[PDB]
Design a protein around this ligand. Structure first.
Ligand SMILES: *[C@@H]1O[C@H](CO)[C@@H](O[C@@H]2O[C@H](CO)[C@@H](O[C@@H]3O[C@H](CO)[C@@H](O)[C@H](O)[C@@H]3O)[C@H](O)[C@H]2NC(C)=O)[C@H](O)[C@H]1NC(C)=O
Ligand SMILES: CC(C)[C@@H]1NC(=O)C[C@H](O)[C@H](Cc2ccccc2)NC(=O)CCCCCCCCCCCNC1=O
Ligand SMILES: *[C@@H]1O[C@H](CO)[C@@H](O[C@@H]2O[C@H](CO)[C@@H](O)[C@H](O)[C@H]2NC(C)=O)[C@H](O)[C@H]1NC(C)=O
Ligand SMILES: O=[P-]([O-])[O-]
Lengths: 97, 241
Protein backbone atom coordinates (compact mmCIF):
# COMPACT_ATOMS: atom_id res chain seq x y z
CA UNK A 1 0.00 0.00 0.00
CA UNK A 2 1.02 3.67 0.07
CA UNK A 3 4.30 4.60 1.81
CA UNK A 4 4.38 7.57 4.20
CA UNK A 5 7.57 9.63 4.26
CA UNK A 6 7.51 12.13 7.14
CA UNK A 7 9.21 15.51 6.46
CA UNK A 8 10.84 18.06 8.68
CA UNK A 9 10.18 21.79 8.24
CA UNK A 10 12.97 24.32 8.86
CA UNK A 11 11.63 27.90 9.04
CA UNK A 12 8.95 27.29 6.38
CA UNK A 13 11.84 27.39 3.86
CA UNK A 14 13.31 23.85 3.73
CA UNK A 15 11.30 20.57 3.81
CA UNK A 16 13.27 17.36 3.88
CA UNK A 17 13.05 13.68 4.76
CA UNK A 18 15.32 10.72 5.36
CA UNK A 19 16.22 8.19 2.68
CA UNK A 20 18.70 5.35 2.55
CA UNK A 21 21.23 4.50 -0.11
CA UNK A 22 23.06 1.17 -0.08
CA UNK A 23 23.12 -2.15 1.67
CA UNK A 24 23.02 -1.71 4.58
CA UNK A 25 21.30 1.70 4.09
CA UNK A 26 23.38 4.85 4.58
CA UNK A 27 20.96 7.60 5.66
CA UNK A 28 20.69 11.06 4.00
CA UNK A 29 18.25 13.89 4.21
CA UNK A 30 16.86 15.12 0.91
CA UNK A 31 14.51 17.63 -0.56
CA UNK A 32 11.82 15.77 -2.52
CA UNK A 33 11.85 18.23 -5.41
CA UNK A 34 9.02 18.29 -8.00
CA UNK A 35 11.10 20.90 -9.93
CA UNK A 36 13.92 18.53 -10.96
CA UNK A 37 14.50 14.87 -11.78
CA UNK A 38 17.90 13.71 -10.46
CA UNK A 39 18.85 12.17 -7.14
CA UNK A 40 22.24 13.08 -5.62
CA UNK A 41 23.95 13.07 -2.24
CA UNK A 42 27.47 14.09 -1.19
CA UNK A 43 30.30 11.63 -1.90
CA UNK A 44 32.97 10.59 0.60
CA UNK A 45 35.20 11.45 -2.41
CA UNK A 46 34.13 15.06 -2.45
CA UNK A 47 36.92 17.58 -3.09
CA UNK A 48 38.55 19.27 -0.10
CA UNK A 49 37.38 22.63 -1.64
CA UNK A 50 33.71 21.57 -1.12
CA UNK A 51 32.91 23.17 2.25
CA UNK A 52 29.33 21.91 2.19
CA UNK A 53 30.61 18.32 2.25
CA UNK A 54 32.43 18.96 5.53
CA UNK A 55 29.15 19.25 7.40
CA UNK A 56 26.79 16.88 5.49
CA UNK A 57 26.48 13.12 5.32
CA UNK A 58 28.64 11.44 2.72
CA UNK A 59 27.98 8.25 0.68
CA UNK A 60 30.72 5.56 0.84
CA UNK A 61 30.30 3.02 -1.98
CA UNK A 62 32.89 0.73 -0.32
CA UNK A 63 30.42 -0.04 2.50
CA UNK A 64 27.53 -1.04 0.20
CA UNK A 65 27.13 -4.59 -1.09
CA UNK A 66 24.59 -3.45 -3.76
CA UNK A 67 26.74 -0.60 -5.20
CA UNK A 68 27.43 -0.86 -8.93
CA UNK A 69 30.00 1.51 -10.44
CA UNK A 70 29.05 3.96 -13.16
CA UNK A 71 31.52 6.88 -12.98
CA UNK A 72 30.06 9.14 -15.71
CA UNK A 73 30.51 12.86 -14.87
CA UNK A 74 27.41 14.99 -14.19
CA UNK A 75 26.80 18.70 -13.62
CA UNK A 76 23.44 20.10 -12.47
CA UNK A 77 22.44 23.76 -12.52
CA UNK A 78 19.49 24.83 -10.38
CA UNK A 79 18.02 28.30 -9.96
CA UNK A 80 19.70 28.56 -6.51
CA UNK A 81 23.06 26.94 -7.24
CA UNK A 82 25.02 24.19 -8.97
CA UNK A 83 27.00 21.00 -8.31
CA UNK A 84 28.95 18.30 -10.05
CA UNK A 85 30.25 14.82 -9.48
CA UNK A 86 29.93 11.32 -10.86
CA UNK A 87 27.11 8.76 -11.20
CA UNK A 88 26.71 5.53 -9.28
CA UNK A 89 24.03 2.85 -8.90
CA UNK A 90 22.55 1.46 -5.68
CA UNK A 91 19.34 0.54 -3.86
CA UNK A 92 17.40 3.54 -2.52
CA UNK A 93 15.24 3.04 0.61
CA UNK A 94 12.32 5.34 1.52
CA UNK A 95 12.26 5.92 4.42
CA UNK A 96 15.83 5.08 5.44
CA UNK A 97 14.71 2.63 8.20
CA UNK B 1 8.91 1.35 3.37
CA UNK B 2 10.04 0.74 -0.18
CA UNK B 3 13.38 -0.33 -1.75
CA UNK B 4 13.96 0.92 -5.27
CA UNK B 5 16.62 -1.29 -6.82
CA UNK B 6 19.22 -0.33 -9.39
CA UNK B 7 18.77 3.44 -8.98
CA UNK B 8 21.32 5.60 -10.75
CA UNK B 9 22.23 8.74 -8.71
CA UNK B 10 24.85 11.41 -8.35
CA UNK B 11 27.79 11.32 -5.91
CA UNK B 12 28.47 15.06 -5.52
CA UNK B 13 32.11 16.10 -5.37
CA UNK B 14 31.95 19.86 -6.05
CA UNK B 15 29.35 22.31 -4.73
CA UNK B 16 30.48 25.84 -5.61
CA UNK B 17 29.06 28.94 -3.87
CA UNK B 18 27.13 28.88 -0.63
CA UNK B 19 23.75 27.29 -1.49
CA UNK B 20 24.43 23.95 0.11
CA UNK B 21 26.58 24.98 3.06
CA UNK B 22 24.06 25.92 5.69
CA UNK B 23 21.21 23.81 4.15
CA UNK B 24 19.59 21.36 6.56
CA UNK B 25 19.45 18.65 3.89
CA UNK B 26 22.25 16.54 2.38
CA UNK B 27 20.87 16.20 -1.16
CA UNK B 28 17.94 16.42 -3.57
CA UNK B 29 15.61 13.72 -4.87
CA UNK B 30 13.97 15.00 -8.04
CA UNK B 31 10.34 13.97 -8.75
CA UNK B 32 9.63 15.72 -12.10
CA UNK B 33 9.50 14.02 -15.52
CA UNK B 34 12.39 12.18 -17.16
CA UNK B 35 12.59 14.92 -19.90
CA UNK B 36 14.50 17.22 -17.49
CA UNK B 37 16.79 14.61 -15.93
CA UNK B 38 20.46 15.50 -16.39
CA UNK B 39 22.32 12.72 -18.24
CA UNK B 40 18.87 11.21 -18.97
CA UNK B 41 19.04 9.23 -15.73
CA UNK B 42 15.80 7.35 -15.02
CA UNK B 43 14.29 9.11 -11.93
CA UNK B 44 13.48 7.49 -8.65
CA UNK B 45 9.69 7.54 -9.01
CA UNK B 46 10.00 6.23 -12.60
CA UNK B 47 12.10 3.31 -11.37
CA UNK B 48 9.57 2.79 -8.56
CA UNK B 49 6.72 2.61 -11.15
CA UNK B 50 8.61 0.18 -13.40
CA UNK B 51 9.28 -2.08 -10.38
CA UNK B 52 5.52 -2.01 -9.47
CA UNK B 53 6.26 -0.97 -5.93
CA UNK B 54 3.02 1.06 -5.67
CA UNK B 55 -0.49 0.34 -7.00
CA UNK B 56 -1.30 3.97 -7.85
CA UNK B 57 1.39 5.93 -9.65
CA UNK B 58 0.74 9.13 -7.72
CA UNK B 59 2.42 10.92 -4.84
CA UNK B 60 1.24 13.68 -2.54
CA UNK B 61 2.58 16.43 -0.27
CA UNK B 62 1.40 17.99 2.93
CA UNK B 63 3.62 20.88 4.05
CA UNK B 64 3.04 22.44 7.45
CA UNK B 65 3.20 26.25 7.46
CA UNK B 66 3.71 26.59 11.22
CA UNK B 67 7.50 26.30 11.35
CA UNK B 68 7.36 24.65 14.81
CA UNK B 69 4.66 22.09 14.01
CA UNK B 70 5.28 18.36 14.23
CA UNK B 71 5.19 16.74 11.76
CA UNK B 72 6.79 19.25 9.39
CA UNK B 73 5.10 17.61 6.42
CA UNK B 74 4.48 14.28 4.71
CA UNK B 75 5.19 12.89 1.28
CA UNK B 76 2.88 9.94 0.55
CA UNK B 77 4.25 7.65 -2.16
CA UNK B 78 1.50 5.82 -4.06
CA UNK B 79 -1.51 7.55 -2.46
CA UNK B 80 -3.09 10.53 -0.74
CA UNK B 81 -3.41 11.10 3.00
CA UNK B 82 -6.85 12.22 4.26
CA UNK B 83 -5.33 13.24 7.58
CA UNK B 84 -4.00 16.38 5.90
CA UNK B 85 -6.72 17.72 3.72
CA UNK B 86 -10.37 18.58 3.88
CA UNK B 87 -12.92 18.19 1.11
CA UNK B 88 -12.42 16.92 -2.42
CA UNK B 89 -9.48 17.14 -4.81
CA UNK B 90 -9.72 19.35 -7.90
CA UNK B 91 -7.51 18.48 -10.89
CA UNK B 92 -5.61 20.32 -13.65
CA UNK B 93 -3.93 18.64 -16.58
CA UNK B 94 -0.18 18.89 -16.99
CA UNK B 95 0.57 21.04 -20.11
CA UNK B 96 4.26 20.35 -20.78
CA UNK B 97 5.50 17.02 -19.26
CA UNK B 98 8.89 18.14 -18.05
CA UNK B 99 8.33 20.17 -14.90
CA UNK B 100 4.92 19.66 -13.30
CA UNK B 101 3.55 22.44 -15.48
CA UNK B 102 -0.06 23.60 -15.57
CA UNK B 103 -2.05 26.54 -16.97
CA UNK B 104 -2.67 29.46 -14.61
CA UNK B 105 -5.76 31.47 -15.54
CA UNK B 106 -4.94 34.66 -13.59
CA UNK B 107 -3.50 36.14 -10.40
CA UNK B 108 -5.76 38.68 -8.58
CA UNK B 109 -4.89 40.99 -5.68
CA UNK B 110 -8.21 41.67 -3.78
CA UNK B 111 -7.77 45.45 -4.13
CA UNK B 112 -7.99 45.10 -7.93
CA UNK B 113 -4.61 44.45 -9.57
CA UNK B 114 -4.73 41.47 -11.96
CA UNK B 115 -1.54 39.73 -13.18
CA UNK B 116 -1.34 36.93 -15.75
CA UNK B 117 -4.46 38.62 -17.17
CA UNK B 118 -5.06 36.38 -20.19
CA UNK B 119 -3.55 33.21 -18.70
CA UNK B 120 0.00 31.93 -18.41
CA UNK B 121 2.03 28.82 -17.53
CA UNK B 122 3.16 27.83 -14.04
CA UNK B 123 5.01 24.94 -12.44
CA UNK B 124 4.16 23.26 -9.15
CA UNK B 125 7.49 23.05 -7.32
CA UNK B 126 7.97 21.67 -3.83
CA UNK B 127 11.65 22.63 -4.16
CA UNK B 128 11.00 26.39 -4.32
CA UNK B 129 10.07 28.05 -0.98
CA UNK B 130 8.33 31.12 -2.43
CA UNK B 131 5.86 31.90 -5.13
CA UNK B 132 7.74 33.17 -8.22
CA UNK B 133 6.55 35.35 -11.06
CA UNK B 134 7.98 37.61 -13.72
CA UNK B 135 10.02 40.55 -12.37
CA UNK B 136 7.79 43.33 -13.74
CA UNK B 137 4.47 41.73 -12.66
CA UNK B 138 5.82 40.90 -9.16
CA UNK B 139 7.06 44.50 -8.80
CA UNK B 140 3.46 45.67 -9.42
CA UNK B 141 2.11 43.12 -6.93
CA UNK B 142 4.53 44.21 -4.25
CA UNK B 143 3.66 47.90 -4.77
CA UNK B 144 -0.06 46.94 -4.39
CA UNK B 145 0.53 45.38 -0.97
CA UNK B 146 3.13 47.89 0.32
CA UNK B 147 6.15 45.60 0.33
CA UNK B 148 9.66 46.98 -0.33
CA UNK B 149 12.64 45.42 -2.09
CA UNK B 150 15.24 43.43 -0.13
CA UNK B 151 17.71 41.78 -2.60
CA UNK B 152 17.65 39.44 -5.63
CA UNK B 153 13.92 39.82 -6.33
CA UNK B 154 12.77 39.37 -2.70
CA UNK B 155 10.70 41.91 -0.79
CA UNK B 156 9.83 42.61 2.88
CA UNK B 157 6.64 43.88 4.55
CA UNK B 158 6.44 45.50 7.98
CA UNK B 159 5.18 42.77 10.28
CA UNK B 160 2.58 45.07 11.86
CA UNK B 161 1.00 45.62 8.38
CA UNK B 162 0.51 41.93 7.50
CA UNK B 163 -2.90 41.48 9.09
CA UNK B 164 -4.42 44.30 6.94
CA UNK B 165 -2.98 43.27 3.54
CA UNK B 166 -5.31 42.20 0.76
CA UNK B 167 -5.85 38.54 -0.10
CA UNK B 168 -4.28 37.21 -3.33
CA UNK B 169 -6.20 34.63 -5.40
CA UNK B 170 -4.80 32.33 -8.11
CA UNK B 171 -7.31 31.02 -10.63
CA UNK B 172 -6.55 27.46 -11.71
CA UNK B 173 -8.98 25.29 -13.73
CA UNK B 174 -11.57 28.06 -13.36
CA UNK B 175 -11.56 27.84 -9.53
CA UNK B 176 -10.14 30.44 -7.07
CA UNK B 177 -7.33 29.47 -4.66
CA UNK B 178 -7.12 32.23 -2.09
CA UNK B 179 -3.96 33.06 -0.13
CA UNK B 180 -4.44 35.17 2.96
CA UNK B 181 -1.68 37.59 4.02
CA UNK B 182 -0.72 35.02 6.70
CA UNK B 183 -0.48 32.37 3.94
CA UNK B 184 1.67 34.49 1.58
CA UNK B 185 4.04 36.03 4.09
CA UNK B 186 6.75 34.25 6.11
CA UNK B 187 8.57 34.98 9.33
CA UNK B 188 12.33 35.10 8.96
CA UNK B 189 14.82 35.34 11.85
CA UNK B 190 18.48 36.24 11.90
CA UNK B 191 20.58 37.29 14.92
CA UNK B 192 17.61 37.67 17.27
CA UNK B 193 15.54 39.91 14.92
CA UNK B 194 12.21 38.99 13.24
CA UNK B 195 11.08 40.25 9.87
CA UNK B 196 8.22 39.38 7.49
CA UNK B 197 9.21 38.23 4.02
CA UNK B 198 6.77 38.68 1.08
CA UNK B 199 6.08 35.24 -0.27
CA UNK B 200 6.30 36.37 -3.93
CA UNK B 201 9.74 36.67 -5.55
CA UNK B 202 10.42 38.29 -8.96
CA UNK B 203 12.54 36.19 -11.38
CA UNK B 204 12.49 36.06 -15.17
CA UNK B 205 12.88 32.56 -16.51
CA UNK B 206 13.90 32.88 -20.16
CA UNK B 207 12.51 31.03 -23.12
CA UNK B 208 12.28 28.31 -24.16
CA UNK B 209 11.21 27.03 -20.71
CA UNK B 210 9.91 30.34 -19.54
CA UNK B 211 8.31 32.58 -18.76
CA UNK B 212 6.87 30.57 -15.84
CA UNK B 213 5.20 31.37 -12.53
CA UNK B 214 6.11 28.97 -9.69
CA UNK B 215 3.59 27.63 -7.17
CA UNK B 216 6.09 26.97 -4.38
CA UNK B 217 5.80 25.94 -0.72
CA UNK B 218 3.66 29.04 0.05
CA UNK B 219 0.95 27.55 -2.16
CA UNK B 220 1.42 23.83 -1.52
CA UNK B 221 1.31 24.60 2.22
CA UNK B 222 -2.25 25.94 1.93
CA UNK B 223 -3.28 23.45 -0.76
CA UNK B 224 -2.42 19.79 -0.26
CA UNK B 225 -1.01 18.62 -3.60
CA UNK B 226 -1.27 15.40 -5.55
CA UNK B 227 1.07 14.62 -8.43
CA UNK B 228 -0.44 11.95 -10.74
CA UNK B 229 1.75 10.20 -13.36
CA UNK B 230 -1.03 7.74 -14.44
CA UNK B 231 -3.22 10.59 -15.66
CA UNK B 232 -0.63 13.42 -16.03
CA UNK B 233 -2.46 15.79 -13.72
CA UNK B 234 -2.04 17.76 -10.51
CA UNK B 235 -4.69 17.76 -7.76
CA UNK B 236 -5.28 20.36 -5.04
CA UNK B 237 -7.37 20.28 -1.86
CA UNK B 238 -7.48 22.65 1.10
CA UNK B 239 -4.86 21.47 3.59
CA UNK B 240 -5.75 20.83 7.25
CA UNK B 241 -6.12 24.17 9.03
C1 LIG C 1 -7.00 16.16 -19.59
O1 LIG C 1 -6.24 15.04 -20.01
C2 LIG C 1 -6.99 13.85 -20.35
C3 LIG C 1 -6.02 12.76 -20.81
O2 LIG C 1 -5.22 13.24 -21.90
C4 LIG C 1 -8.02 14.19 -21.44
O3 LIG C 1 -8.82 13.15 -21.67
C5 LIG C 1 -9.17 12.72 -23.00
O4 LIG C 1 -10.25 13.51 -23.51
C6 LIG C 1 -10.61 13.23 -24.88
C7 LIG C 1 -11.84 14.06 -25.26
O5 LIG C 1 -11.45 15.40 -25.60
C8 LIG C 1 -10.86 11.73 -25.12
O6 LIG C 1 -11.32 11.28 -26.30
C9 LIG C 1 -11.84 10.09 -26.92
O7 LIG C 1 -10.82 9.08 -27.02
C10 LIG C 1 -11.32 7.81 -27.45
C11 LIG C 1 -10.16 6.81 -27.48
O8 LIG C 1 -10.02 6.21 -26.19
C12 LIG C 1 -12.01 7.91 -28.81
O9 LIG C 1 -12.74 6.70 -29.03
C13 LIG C 1 -12.97 9.10 -28.92
O10 LIG C 1 -13.32 9.34 -30.29
C14 LIG C 1 -12.38 10.38 -28.31
O11 LIG C 1 -11.32 10.90 -29.13
C15 LIG C 1 -9.80 10.84 -24.44
O12 LIG C 1 -10.18 9.46 -24.45
C16 LIG C 1 -9.63 11.27 -22.99
N1 LIG C 1 -8.71 10.41 -22.24
C17 LIG C 1 -9.00 9.87 -21.04
C18 LIG C 1 -7.91 9.07 -20.39
O13 LIG C 1 -10.08 10.02 -20.48
C19 LIG C 1 -8.91 15.35 -21.01
O14 LIG C 1 -9.80 15.74 -22.07
C20 LIG C 1 -8.04 16.54 -20.64
N2 LIG C 1 -8.84 17.56 -20.00
C21 LIG C 1 -8.89 18.80 -20.44
C22 LIG C 1 -9.73 19.73 -19.62
O15 LIG C 1 -8.30 19.14 -21.45
C1 LIG D 1 15.56 20.80 -13.73
C2 LIG D 1 16.71 21.23 -12.86
C3 LIG D 1 18.06 21.06 -13.54
C4 LIG D 1 16.57 22.66 -12.27
N1 LIG D 1 15.48 22.80 -11.33
C5 LIG D 1 15.37 23.88 -10.51
O1 LIG D 1 16.30 24.73 -10.45
C6 LIG D 1 14.16 23.94 -9.58
C7 LIG D 1 14.32 23.11 -8.31
O2 LIG D 1 13.01 23.04 -7.69
C8 LIG D 1 15.36 23.70 -7.30
C9 LIG D 1 15.58 22.68 -6.18
C10 LIG D 1 16.61 23.07 -5.18
C11 LIG D 1 16.25 23.03 -3.85
C12 LIG D 1 17.21 23.31 -2.87
C13 LIG D 1 18.50 23.71 -3.22
C14 LIG D 1 18.84 23.74 -4.56
C15 LIG D 1 17.88 23.42 -5.54
N2 LIG D 1 14.88 24.95 -6.80
C16 LIG D 1 15.60 26.10 -6.85
O3 LIG D 1 16.78 26.14 -7.29
C17 LIG D 1 14.89 27.31 -6.30
C18 LIG D 1 14.71 28.32 -7.41
C19 LIG D 1 14.11 27.79 -8.69
C20 LIG D 1 13.75 28.88 -9.65
C21 LIG D 1 13.19 28.30 -10.94
C22 LIG D 1 14.18 27.56 -11.85
C23 LIG D 1 14.56 28.31 -13.08
C24 LIG D 1 15.45 27.56 -14.04
C25 LIG D 1 16.81 27.23 -13.47
C26 LIG D 1 17.73 26.60 -14.51
C27 LIG D 1 17.38 25.23 -15.04
N3 LIG D 1 17.40 24.28 -13.94
C28 LIG D 1 16.31 23.71 -13.39
O4 LIG D 1 15.14 23.96 -13.74
C1 LIG E 1 25.65 4.92 -16.34
O1 LIG E 1 24.22 4.86 -16.19
C2 LIG E 1 23.43 4.97 -17.38
C3 LIG E 1 21.97 4.97 -17.03
O2 LIG E 1 21.68 6.06 -16.19
C4 LIG E 1 23.68 3.79 -18.32
O3 LIG E 1 22.91 3.94 -19.52
C5 LIG E 1 21.86 2.96 -19.61
O4 LIG E 1 22.44 1.67 -19.79
C6 LIG E 1 21.66 0.56 -20.25
C7 LIG E 1 22.62 -0.40 -20.95
O5 LIG E 1 23.45 -1.05 -19.99
C8 LIG E 1 20.58 0.90 -21.26
O6 LIG E 1 19.62 -0.17 -21.28
C9 LIG E 1 19.90 2.22 -20.96
O7 LIG E 1 19.00 2.54 -22.03
C10 LIG E 1 20.93 3.33 -20.78
N1 LIG E 1 20.23 4.60 -20.64
C11 LIG E 1 20.72 5.78 -21.05
C12 LIG E 1 19.82 6.96 -20.87
O8 LIG E 1 21.83 5.91 -21.53
C13 LIG E 1 25.17 3.78 -18.61
O9 LIG E 1 25.46 2.54 -19.28
C14 LIG E 1 26.04 3.82 -17.36
N2 LIG E 1 27.45 3.89 -17.74
C15 LIG E 1 28.42 3.16 -17.20
C16 LIG E 1 29.79 3.42 -17.74
O10 LIG E 1 28.21 2.35 -16.32
O1 LIG F 1 16.27 20.20 12.44
P1 LIG F 1 17.30 19.10 12.30
O2 LIG F 1 17.26 18.47 10.90
O3 LIG F 1 18.66 19.68 12.64
Amino acid sequence: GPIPEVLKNYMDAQYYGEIGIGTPPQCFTVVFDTGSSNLWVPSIHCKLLDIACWIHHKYNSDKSSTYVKNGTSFDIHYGSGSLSGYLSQDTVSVPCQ
Amino acid sequence: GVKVERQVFGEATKQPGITFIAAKFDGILGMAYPRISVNNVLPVFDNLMQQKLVDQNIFSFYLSRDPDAQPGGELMLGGTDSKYYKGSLSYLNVTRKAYWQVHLDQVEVASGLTLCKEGCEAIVDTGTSLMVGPVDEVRELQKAIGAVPLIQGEYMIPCEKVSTLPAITLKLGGKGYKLSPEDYTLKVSQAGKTLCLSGFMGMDIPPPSGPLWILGDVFIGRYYTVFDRDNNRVGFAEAAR
